[PDB]
Amino acid sequence: MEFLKRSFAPLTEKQWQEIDNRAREIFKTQLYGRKFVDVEGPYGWEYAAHPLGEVEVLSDENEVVKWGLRKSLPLIELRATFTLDLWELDNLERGKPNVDLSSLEETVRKVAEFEDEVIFRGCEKSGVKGLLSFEERKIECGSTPKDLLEAIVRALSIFSKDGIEGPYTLVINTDRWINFLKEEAGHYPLEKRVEECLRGGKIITTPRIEDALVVSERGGDFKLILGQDLSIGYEDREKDAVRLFITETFTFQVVNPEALILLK
Amino acid sequence: MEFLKRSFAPLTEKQWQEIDNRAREIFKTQLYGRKFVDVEGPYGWEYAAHPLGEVEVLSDENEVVKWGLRKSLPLIELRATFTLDLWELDNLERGKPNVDLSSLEETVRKVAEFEDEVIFRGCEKSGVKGLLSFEERKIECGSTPKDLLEAIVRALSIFSKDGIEGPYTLVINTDRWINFLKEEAGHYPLEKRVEECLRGGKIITTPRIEDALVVSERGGDFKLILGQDLSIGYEDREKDAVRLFITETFTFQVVNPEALILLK
Amino acid sequence: MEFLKRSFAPLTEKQWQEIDNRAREIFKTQLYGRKFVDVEGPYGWEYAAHPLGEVEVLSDENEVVKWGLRKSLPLIELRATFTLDLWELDNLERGKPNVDLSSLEETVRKVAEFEDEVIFRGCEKSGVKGLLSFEERKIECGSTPKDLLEAIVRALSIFSKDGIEGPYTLVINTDRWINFLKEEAGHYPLEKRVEECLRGGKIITTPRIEDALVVSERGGDFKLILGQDLSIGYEDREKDAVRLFITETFTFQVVNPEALILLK
């Protein structure tokens, strides 16, 4: 929006469109948490904190009037900057079909990594606890495909006792998935054995996790709080090059850890 | 069209039709690039160059008035000739069901090879760079079916980081495909393992490539510029035999090499 | 248009208008070729090459499939820059009737010279051959007004044998015209003798030619290919002064040299 100062950038709508398109593509392919966790919002651009629903009592014990502070999560405000040559975007309206947008891509990837780190590991400063921080819900299993299938069945039994329902999905490191696919036959695809044991579920290979998670997708158990979603705006000129920025505001909340299981 | 001088050939519409039909069949089965790359046009018959969208500056540095030349790709104009006996096409209207059209077939195959060479290797004279010239995007993999599947998964991970989406297709040499199918079981078809790892994609066996390519089919990344598409016209008489020709005008452009991956 | 970034210049419409007006005036008075040669287009801003209608065959002699490259003329892209003080354009809306626009005028004159040089001499780099390069069509004549009239009659006889019709015009260096007017009487204006021998034609005094040309104006024999016509846009700030630029894209083609005659 208006705080992005896009109107003041020496660019045509065509160039803005190309930039936005490439950003969207990289993001859709590089944002992995967005695949498992719900999204609420956007609340922005002014939204500053998400309530937790508790009071920390600061009053002493023998005070007549008891009082405390109501708790919330501060939204994380993200800024990153790109620099694009001008002589090279105007070749777009000169008829060039492929305009170099490399710095955009690099920095987009970096911010995607940032958000995925928050979701998966969290942030102490912000008070966010990541999915991989709920060590209290973890299975110890082997390292073969068969061990993996047994572990998945165990996980679904756990979900059963805890009342957790819904489609299930398995988030794996890419390398471990590849090695599971390589380690044993072959006489029936492993992905099918899995999608069967993972009863109507899916597999999602994610390089930002090392081992694996099993999560239910019924809804409402992991949620990303959105103020200002990812947006690109303008800062200044270089002057032969334009400096833009990408920004966001967000927090993350694990609501029901019972819908989460870690695997070794 | 009119530049083809078909009206001046001592032939009936029946004979023209037979000729055109056989040409179309051979072409549909022998034109392999047409299976992966988009086609724009036809622009012909006068279209002479396709713009690139850049200026090469020829002005010196200290000139007051700066100037350069706007760049483009010249269209390649293709001619080949056939000779057909007359006594042998008139047997068509005499009731013969199978008329010999061998020279047509041979020369059609040759021109198909020509276009496929341009697409795959390119042309220095014309300034076309072929698919197999983007060595900067190449994977080193093994030689077994399992190695192949691992390589395909690696390729799709690459497409993932580069923001490349869409159906995927695997262009292979026929011999290597056959040997992959022969080398190991058997207890589950390899083509299915592939179409699965090649997630909803295809395999296309192409004798004009030696090893393999993986390419996305989302659209707009490889494109063939068409002026005058493949057409047959008339030159002269022999006189007992008619001399015809086949012609085309075309260039080729790889727009987004990120949608391209070479395999060993 | 939009590639000119006029909207991003810290200027009001009044100032843009003054600038454009002065540019147009200087151009109309300083563009001499525009007086004789036809103009086609504008094709821009993406137009990159104008077809010539020929194929250069690169195929060897004994190749089965013959091929070549279709030929064209690259458009020349022209850039020049002006710098205008700000404190001095805002006095326009302060009520000043005469705003200093000298750098504009100088640079406009320079680019006009550039285009006239291309038309008259041509450009080797671009492959343009100028009017004064067709030495094969040249008359040797005297240096007196009477010699000039005889030469004009000879030229029209030539046009006669070559089938060239239409109004005729005589492009002369200014100095030679003046000296012809001074050299002999006087008892009947020379311009009238000329316009008579130059049967219903004209005289156009042009400082970018040294001796003279006679050309027919029937149409279609000399033509200027226009992509982006002359236009002014914005580059940056200085910051107390605004930097603008003037740009064009064009080529030139002599189609029928029979409509052209050079005089000594």
Residue numbers in the entry:
A (entry chain A), B (entry chain A), C (entry chain A): 4 to 267
Describing publication, verbatim:
Encapsulin is a kind of protein compartment that exists in a wide variety of bacteria and archaea. Encapsulins are assembled by capsid proteins into an icosahedral shell with a diameter between 24 and 42 nm, which encapsulates native cargo proteins involved in oxidative stress and iron mineralization. The conserved C-terminal extension of native cargo proteins, which is called cargo-loading peptide (CLP), mediates the interaction between the interior surface of encapsulin and cargo protein. Considering their programmability and biocompatibility, encapsulin is a promising platform for the delivery of proteins or small ligands and nanoreactors.
